[PDB]
Ligand binder design. Structure first.
Ligand SMILES: COc1cc(C(=O)N2CCC(N3CCN(C)CC3)CC2)ccc1Nc1ncc2c(n1)N(C(C)C)c1ccccc1C(=O)N2C
Length: 124
């Protein structure tokens, strides 16, 4: 079975929207979300549908852009670093589970390069 997905709201977690978090939603997430390689990353890994009995034995910190998008829309994060870390976790999980040269790894690397370009333009 699949684990429960990562939470996207938490009634006890303080909320904030800094100018950097605004940029992360309106520029960074939006740019990656519309990219041709976004589709594997727009929702949690469905280990049932993909028949991956070991995925959630290996990956204990799952993350995906659908979760990040909802977190940003909900003002779930306090700071930009929490959101940046979620993106980095998502890419890292792909690199852990898969192998060099797999199509999905090359897709993740292309999205990560674009992510890094856009993050370098974060407002100060
Ligand atoms: C919408 O959800 C999906 C749909 C389909 C699908 O069957 N289709 C139809 C054909 C389309 N193709 C047609 C041909 N075009 C050239 C491109 C589009 C594309 C869409 C396949 C996978 C989906 N989700 C998915 N999420 C995260 C993954 C992942 N898969 N992969 C694969 C992507 C490797 C992994 C596989 C195994 C283990 C780990 C992963 C993994 O790391 N990650 C992040």
């Amino acid at each position: 079975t699949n684990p429960p997905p990562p939470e996207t709201s938490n009634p006890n977690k303080p909320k904030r929207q800094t100018n950097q978090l605004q940029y992360l939603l309106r520029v960074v997430l939006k740019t990656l979300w519309k990219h041709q390689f976004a589709w594997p990353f727009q929702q949690p890994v469905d280990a049932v549908k993909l028949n991956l009995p070991d995925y959630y034995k290996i990956i204990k910190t799952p993350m995906d852009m659908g979760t990040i998008k909802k977190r940003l829309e909900n003002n779930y994060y306090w700071n930009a670093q929490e959101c940046i870390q979620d993106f980095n976790t998502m890419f890292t999980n792909c690199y852990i589970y898969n192998k060099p040269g797999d199509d999905i790894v090359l897709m993740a690397e292309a999205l990560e390069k674009l992510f890094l370009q856009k993050i370098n333009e974060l407002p100060t």
